[PDB]
């Protein structure tokens, strides 16, 4: 599909069985999801943004479906105000920027 | 052009007669550039992101050339970790997300 940028590019994604709304973010290297109790082993990580850094939990090889498009990879979980789909997953669904 | 996301989507922009490198960011409502001098009056503003909020200077109706395409809009200047072109200007150059 083709998504215009008049409003925030939010789409539905499926992870850990739950359906959530997430922002297609070309400005994020990684995918960061709001705090949620995901099972599995994880590693600590710090990610930076505007303002500073926050601590998050890193989970590897987590299946994520974006608009019916299947992907799998690293997902970071922490105190973010919005669910963010970064480039690590965007490249997997053949997403590009065009103008 | 069509831009893939295996690497950060950086492009050259020209503003105030200067050339700079900026990140095409669909996850940002506004455009925020690193501290620099710009003609005109500016109003203090605050914007937020992953690691909290920061104080920025707001300049209105500023011409910005992005990859050869012209845009004229609001440009925020402050202590951002990187130059960011947000949706306010991305929509002006007809940018979209596709997959």
């Amino acid at each position: 599909p083709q998504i215009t940028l008049w409003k925030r590019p939010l789409v539905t994604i499926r992870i850990g069985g739950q359906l959530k709304e997430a922002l297609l973010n070309t400005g994020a290297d990684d995918t960061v999801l709001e705090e949620m109790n995901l099972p599995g082993k994880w590693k600590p990580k710090m990610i930076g943004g505007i303002g500073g850094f926050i601590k998050v939990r890193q989970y590897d090889q987590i299946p994520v479906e974006i608009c019916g498009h299947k992907a799998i990879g690293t997902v970071l979980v922490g105190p973010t105000p919005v669910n963010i789909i970064g480039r690590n997953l965007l490249t997997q669904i053949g997403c590009t920027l065009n103008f | 052009p069509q831009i893939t996301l295996w690497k950060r989507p950086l492009v050259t922009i020209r503003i105030g007669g200067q050339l700079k490198e900026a990140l095409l960011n669909t996850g940002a409502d506004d455009t925020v550039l690193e501290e620099m001098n710009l003609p005109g009056k500016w109003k203090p503003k605050m914007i937020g992101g992953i690691g909290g909020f920061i104080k920025v200077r707001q300049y209105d109706q500023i011409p910005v050339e992005i990859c050869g395409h012209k845009a004229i809009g609001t440009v925020l200047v402050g202590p951002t970790p990187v130059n960011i072109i947000g949706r306010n200007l991305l929509t002006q150059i007809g940018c979209t997300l596709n997959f």
Binding site: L23, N25, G27, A28, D29, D30, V32, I47, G48, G49, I50, P81, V82, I84, G86, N88 | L23, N25, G27, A28, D29, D30, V32, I47, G48, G49, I50, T80, P81, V82, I84, G86
Partner: peptide, 9 residues
């Protein structure tokens, strides 16, 4: 507004 730049470092 909200600027969600994320540095994977």
């Amino acid at each position: 507004a909200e600027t969600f730049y994320v540095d994977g470092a």
